[PDB]
Design a protein around this motif. Structure first.
Motif, PDB file in Angstrom:
ATOM      1  N   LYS A   1      10.053   3.947 -10.121  1.00 16.66           N
ATOM      2  CA  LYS A   1      11.826   4.021  -8.852  1.00 16.66           C
ATOM      3  C   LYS A   1      11.368   5.478  -9.392  1.00 16.66           C
ATOM      4  O   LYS A   1      11.911   6.214  -8.091  1.00 16.66           O
ATOM      5  CB  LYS A   1      12.142   3.495 -10.496  1.00 16.66           C
ATOM      6  N   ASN A   2      10.129   6.577 -10.153  1.00 21.01           N
ATOM      7  CA  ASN A   2      10.107   7.454  -9.466  1.00 21.01           C
ATOM      8  C   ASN A   2      11.425   7.641 -11.319  1.00 21.01           C
ATOM      9  O   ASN A   2      11.361   9.492 -11.302  1.00 21.01           O
ATOM     10  CB  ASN A   2      10.399   8.506  -8.542  1.00 21.01           C
ATOM     11  N   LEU A   3      11.915   7.245 -11.746  1.00 23.00           N
ATOM     12  CA  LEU A   3      13.042   8.205 -12.821  1.00 23.00           C
ATOM     13  C   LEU A   3      12.507   8.872 -14.046  1.00 23.00           C
ATOM     14  O   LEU A   3      13.119   9.719 -14.678  1.00 23.00           O
ATOM     15  CB  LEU A   3      14.519   6.755 -12.843  1.00 23.00           C
ATOM     16  N   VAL A   4      11.093   7.261 -14.401  1.00 24.87           N
ATOM     17  CA  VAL A   4      10.396   8.361 -15.512  1.00 24.87           C
ATOM     18  C   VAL A   4       8.774   8.016 -15.339  1.00 24.87           C
ATOM     19  O   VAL A   4       8.837   7.232 -13.614  1.00 24.87           O
ATOM     20  CB  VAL A   4      10.896   7.559 -16.726  1.00 24.87           C
ATOM     21  N   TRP A   5       8.089   9.421 -15.913  1.00 20.16           N
ATOM     22  CA  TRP A   5       6.490   9.387 -15.050  1.00 20.16           C
ATOM     23  C   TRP A   5       6.127   9.339 -16.484  1.00 20.16           C
ATOM     24  O   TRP A   5       6.326   9.502 -17.331  1.00 20.16           O
ATOM     25  CB  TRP A   5       6.421  10.997 -14.579  1.00 20.16           C
ATOM     26  N   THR A   6       4.917   7.630 -15.839  1.00 23.69           N
ATOM     27  CA  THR A   6       3.383   7.648 -16.521  1.00 23.69           C
ATOM     28  C   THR A   6       2.251   7.947 -16.825  1.00 23.69           C
ATOM     29  O   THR A   6       2.271   7.848 -14.918  1.00 23.69           O
ATOM     30  CB  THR A   6       4.177   5.851 -16.743  1.00 23.69           C
ATOM     31  N   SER A   7       1.642   8.388 -17.429  1.00 22.75           N
ATOM     32  CA  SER A   7       0.345   9.180 -17.242  1.00 22.75           C
ATOM     33  C   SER A   7      -0.066   8.139 -17.995  1.00 22.75           C
ATOM     34  O   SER A   7      -0.415   8.282 -19.296  1.00 22.75           O
ATOM     35  CB  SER A   7       0.771  10.566 -17.424  1.00 22.75           C
ATOM     36  N   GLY A   8      -1.516   7.998 -17.444  1.00 24.99           N
ATOM     37  CA  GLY A   8      -2.421   7.337 -18.007  1.00 24.99           C
ATOM     38  C   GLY A   8      -2.610   5.808 -18.260  1.00 24.99           C
ATOM     39  O   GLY A   8      -2.724   5.371 -18.999  1.00 24.99           O
ATOM     40  N   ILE A   9      -0.945   5.399 -17.444  1.00 26.82           N
ATOM     41  CA  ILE A   9      -0.792   3.946 -17.431  1.00 26.82           C
ATOM     42  C   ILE A   9      -2.191   3.103 -16.540  1.00 26.82           C
ATOM     43  O   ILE A   9      -2.199   3.640 -15.723  1.00 26.82           O
ATOM     44  CB  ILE A   9       0.544   3.500 -16.554  1.00 26.82           C
TER      45      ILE A   9
ATOM     46  N   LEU B   1      18.774   0.302 -16.259  1.00 27.80           N
ATOM     47  CA  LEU B   1      17.962   0.653 -16.788  1.00 27.80           C
ATOM     48  C   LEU B   1      18.078   2.507 -17.180  1.00 27.80           C
ATOM     49  O   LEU B   1      16.782   2.942 -17.410  1.00 27.80           O
ATOM     50  CB  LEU B   1      17.094   1.184 -14.697  1.00 27.80           C
ATOM     51  N   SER B   2      18.683   2.955 -17.244  1.00 33.32           N
ATOM     52  CA  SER B   2      18.910   4.457 -17.254  1.00 33.32           C
ATOM     53  C   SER B   2      18.766   5.371 -18.445  1.00 33.32           C
ATOM     54  O   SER B   2      18.410   5.462 -18.634  1.00 33.32           O
ATOM     55  CB  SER B   2      20.839   4.863 -16.650  1.00 33.32           C
ATOM     56  N   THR B   3      18.835   3.540 -19.561  1.00 38.11           N
ATOM     57  CA  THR B   3      18.710   4.191 -20.969  1.00 38.11           C
ATOM     58  C   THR B   3      16.926   4.108 -21.863  1.00 38.11           C
ATOM     59  O   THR B   3      16.493   5.363 -21.495  1.00 38.11           O
ATOM     60  CB  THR B   3      18.908   3.107 -21.987  1.00 38.11           C
ATOM     61  N   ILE B   4      16.590   3.958 -20.650  1.00 35.67           N
ATOM     62  CA  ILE B   4      14.204   4.093 -20.785  1.00 35.67           C
ATOM     63  C   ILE B   4      14.033   4.546 -20.452  1.00 35.67           C
ATOM     64  O   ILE B   4      13.705   5.840 -20.515  1.00 35.67           O
ATOM     65  CB  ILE B   4      13.510   2.633 -19.757  1.00 35.67           C
ATOM     66  N   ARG B   5      14.647   5.486 -19.124  1.00 30.68           N
ATOM     67  CA  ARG B   5      14.402   7.004 -17.893  1.00 30.68           C
ATOM     68  C   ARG B   5      15.221   7.799 -19.196  1.00 30.68           C
ATOM     69  O   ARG B   5      14.002   8.627 -19.228  1.00 30.68           O
ATOM     70  CB  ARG B   5      15.783   6.889 -16.933  1.00 30.68           C
ATOM     71  N   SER B   6      16.508   8.148 -20.344  1.00 25.94           N
ATOM     72  CA  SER B   6      16.092   9.054 -20.526  1.00 25.94           C
ATOM     73  C   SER B   6      15.473   9.304 -21.593  1.00 25.94           C
ATOM     74  O   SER B   6      15.326  10.534 -22.311  1.00 25.94           O
ATOM     75  CB  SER B   6      17.748   7.735 -21.636  1.00 25.94           C
ATOM     76  N   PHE B   7      14.962   8.285 -22.484  1.00 24.82           N
ATOM     77  CA  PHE B   7      14.123   8.713 -23.097  1.00 24.82           C
ATOM     78  C   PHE B   7      13.304   9.960 -21.996  1.00 24.82           C
ATOM     79  O   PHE B   7      13.040  11.010 -22.885  1.00 24.82           O
ATOM     80  CB  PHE B   7      12.458   8.114 -23.654  1.00 24.82           C
ATOM     81  N   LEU B   8      12.899  10.063 -21.292  1.00 24.10           N
ATOM     82  CA  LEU B   8      12.616  10.442 -20.178  1.00 24.10           C
ATOM     83  C   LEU B   8      10.976  11.067 -20.297  1.00 24.10           C
ATOM     84  O   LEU B   8      10.852  12.577 -19.844  1.00 24.10           O
ATOM     85  CB  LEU B   8      13.508  11.252 -19.976  1.00 24.10           C
TER      86      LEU B   8
ATOM     87  N   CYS C   1       0.581  -1.298   0.069  1.00 28.96           N
ATOM     88  CA  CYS C   1      -0.191   0.000   0.246  1.00 28.96           C
ATOM     89  C   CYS C   1       1.136   1.339   0.387  1.00 28.96           C
ATOM     90  O   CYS C   1       0.597   2.121  -0.401  1.00 28.96           O
ATOM     91  CB  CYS C   1      -1.214  -0.239   1.788  1.00 28.96           C
ATOM     92  N   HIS C   2       1.529   1.026   0.597  1.00 29.30           N
ATOM     93  CA  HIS C   2       3.102   1.666   0.644  1.00 29.30           C
ATOM     94  C   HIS C   2       3.387   2.433  -0.590  1.00 29.30           C
ATOM     95  O   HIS C   2       3.364   3.863  -1.164  1.00 29.30           O
ATOM     96  CB  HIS C   2       4.386   2.041   1.534  1.00 29.30           C
ATOM     97  N   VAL C   3       3.648   1.427  -1.541  1.00 27.93           N
ATOM     98  CA  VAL C   3       3.996   1.691  -2.851  1.00 27.93           C
ATOM     99  C   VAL C   3       3.012   2.280  -4.089  1.00 27.93           C
ATOM    100  O   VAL C   3       3.029   2.646  -4.791  1.00 27.93           O
ATOM    101  CB  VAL C   3       4.874   0.468  -3.410  1.00 27.93           C
ATOM    102  N   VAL C   4       1.893   1.822  -3.313  1.00 24.92           N
ATOM    103  CA  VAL C   4       0.525   1.480  -4.440  1.00 24.92           C
ATOM    104  C   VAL C   4       0.557   3.408  -4.466  1.00 24.92           C
ATOM    105  O   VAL C   4      -0.151   3.882  -5.024  1.00 24.92           O
ATOM    106  CB  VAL C   4      -0.299   1.012  -3.940  1.00 24.92           C
ATOM    107  N   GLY C   5       0.332   3.854  -2.297  1.00 28.66           N
ATOM    108  CA  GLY C   5       0.381   5.101  -2.804  1.00 28.66           C
ATOM    109  C   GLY C   5       1.147   6.292  -3.304  1.00 28.66           C
ATOM    110  O   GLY C   5       0.922   7.155  -3.270  1.00 28.66           O
ATOM    111  N   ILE C   6       2.306   5.720  -3.556  1.00 30.09           N
ATOM    112  CA  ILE C   6       2.697   6.531  -4.337  1.00 30.09           C
ATOM    113  C   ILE C   6       2.853   6.355  -6.228  1.00 30.09           C
ATOM    114  O   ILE C   6       3.653   6.818  -6.807  1.00 30.09           O
ATOM    115  CB  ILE C   6       4.261   6.328  -3.895  1.00 30.09           C
ATOM    116  N   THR C   7       2.363   5.330  -6.859  1.00 23.71           N
ATOM    117  CA  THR C   7       2.589   5.044  -7.880  1.00 23.71           C
ATOM    118  C   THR C   7       1.034   5.198  -8.971  1.00 23.71           C
ATOM    119  O   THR C   7       1.309   4.718  -9.745  1.00 23.71           O
ATOM    120  CB  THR C   7       3.358   3.876  -8.256  1.00 23.71           C
ATOM    121  N   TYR C   8       0.272   5.286  -8.334  1.00 20.94           N
ATOM    122  CA  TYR C   8      -1.188   4.478  -8.744  1.00 20.94           C
ATOM    123  C   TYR C   8      -1.458   6.669  -8.388  1.00 20.94           C
ATOM    124  O   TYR C   8      -2.267   6.606  -7.309  1.00 20.94           O
ATOM    125  CB  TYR C   8      -1.821   3.650  -8.037  1.00 20.94           C
TER     126      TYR C   8
END
Lengths: 204, 258
Positions: free
Chosen positions: B217-225, B176-183, A142-149
């Motif tokens: 991870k938060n290196l890259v941000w995805t919207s509407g996933i 992992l780094s290359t995928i974030r690089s599209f960023l 839930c910690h991860v979910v609260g951060i990623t969704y």
């Protein structure tokens, strides 16, 4: 209960050099057992135990080591699990069931929750004595979910939490304040002066 | 007290070879002592201390601290990409040890920034240059093979490094780094384009999983996933501009002063 009664002595042991004497393992191992049953925790003591095993190989205890690692996992997102791994050499990490436990931890660390629950032998012996193990894992999820969704399918969340009934899912949504929507609801002058200076510098 | 510090460093190193990570780290924390005594007594001791610091950094998740200590022991490419040149005063065997330390640092160094530097390093060897190329390629298949061939280098005691643990961990970060690089930088992205790019990664199902995992991870941000549509969506500016202007001025200053 027992945990609180042993706490003082263990704390004193950890404050000095007796923590390096394997003769104290019997006491530290019973302390680990109490952490499991009462769902209590003491990372410093557990790391001291792992250290004693690494330094005095003949004392290596499979069950205690497995419980230490499993309890460490219940403490994610903290670094507990990683620190414990730093205290176990390759040969021991490769032994059953330490190898299997590290594999399970790996699934959690990499956040493959569905795979975790699937690979988790629910009726596993070592898990029976570790009170609240499954719910602790859910707290991390839930910690991860609260951060990623932002929003998440009701069915999906229940799956990720270990295939919960709608009633059980409700318990966790309630715990973190998530609610269903359409679905479960989850979630000048200075600048000018700076330019003037920059310009002047450039001109110069 | 310099001799005592040396004893601590040696003892810590011995513990690390046969010793637990946390105790060694604590020793390292006590260990640092004024530079000057070491400088007066010998050139090498300082280099050894730098190497120890680098090792601690490597044990530590951050590669930054070790990056500084290693460069001081040996010359390293600076921020703003200026060459850092080390003194040759230390005895030749010590210098060779320092070169070995620099080779070790490359591993820390690559993580610290960029990009394709081996100029100080000999051109002919493919051991390090090849590794650099593989990272540049962004394809694991070459990276994996590089570990496989230069399996011998990693091994160099065997119990101490039974499983190659560190190298594998480092490689997984590197992948992992290359995928974030599209960023991201795209408001809304076709799923198919993402699938084609994520397909290259070894797991086929990773993009459904690999893409969501990246968001965690938060290196890259995805919207509407995870959307029904299935297509990902993707004063501050002034500050950035001002920062750039500052850098430009700094460069000019150095030029004028020069």
């Amino acid at each position: 209960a027992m945990f609180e009664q042993m706490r003082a002595n263990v704390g004193k042991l950890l404050k000095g050099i007796d923590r390096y004497n394997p003769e104290n393992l019997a006491t530290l191992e019973r302390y680990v057992e109490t952490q499991a049953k009462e769902n209590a925790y003491d990372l410093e003591a557990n790391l001291a135990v792992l250290k004693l095993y690494q330094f005095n190989p003949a004392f290596f205890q499979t069950t205690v080591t497995a419980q230490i690692l499993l309890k460490a996992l219940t403490n994610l997102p903290h670094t507990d699990f990683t620190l414990c791994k730093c205290m176990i050499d390759q040969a021991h990490q490769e032994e059953r069931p330490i190898r299997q436990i590290l594999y399970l931890g790996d699934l959690l660390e990499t956040c493959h929750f569905q795979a975790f629950w699937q690979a988790l032998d629910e009726n596993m012996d070592l898990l029976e004595g570790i009170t609240g193990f499954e719910d602790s894992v859910r707290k991390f999820i839930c910690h991860v979910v609260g951060i990623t969704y932002q929003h998440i399918d009701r069915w999906l969340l229940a799956e990720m939490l270990g295939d919960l009934s709608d009633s059980q899912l409700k318990v966790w949504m309630s715990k973190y304040g998530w609610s269903a929507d359409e679905q479960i609801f989850i979630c000048x002058x200075x600048x000018x002066x700076x330019x003037x200076x920059x310009x002047x510098x450039x001109x110069x | 007290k310099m001799l005592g510090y040396f004893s601590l460093v040696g003892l810590l190193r011995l513990h690390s070879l046969l010793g637990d990570y946390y105790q060694a780290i604590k020793v390292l924390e006590n260990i640092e002592l004024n530079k000057k005594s070491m400088y007066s007594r010998v050139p090498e001791c300082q280099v050894t201390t730098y190497y120890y610091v680098g090792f601690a950094y490597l044990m530590m998740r951050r590669y930054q601290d070790a990056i500084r200590v290693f460069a001081n022991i040996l010359l390293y490419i600076q921020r703003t990409k200026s060459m850092f040149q080390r003194t040759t005063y230390k005895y030749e065997m010590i210098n060779k040890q320092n070169e070995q330390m620099h080779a070790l640092l490359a591993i820390a160094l690559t993580m610290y920034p960029m990009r394709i530097d081996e100029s100080i390093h000999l051109q002919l060897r493919e051991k390090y240059g090849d590794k650099m190329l593989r990272m540049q390629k962004g394809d694991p298949q070459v990276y994996e093979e590089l570990f496989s061939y230069s399996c011998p280098k990693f091994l160099s005691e065997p119990f101490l490094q039974q499983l190659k643990v560190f190298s594998d961990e480092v490689q997984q970060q590197a992948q992992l780094s290359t995928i974030r690089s599209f960023l991201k930088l795209y408001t809304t992205m076709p799923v198919a384009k993402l699938a084609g790019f994520l397909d290259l990664t070894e797991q086929e199902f990773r993009i459904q999983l690999l893409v969501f995992k990246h968001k965690m991870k938060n290196l890259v941000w995805t919207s509407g996933i995870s959307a029904l549509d299935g297509e990902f969506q993707s004063x501050x500016x002034x500050x950035x501009x001002x920062x750039x202007x500052x850098x430009x001025x700094x460069x000019x200053x150095x030029x004028x002063x020069x």
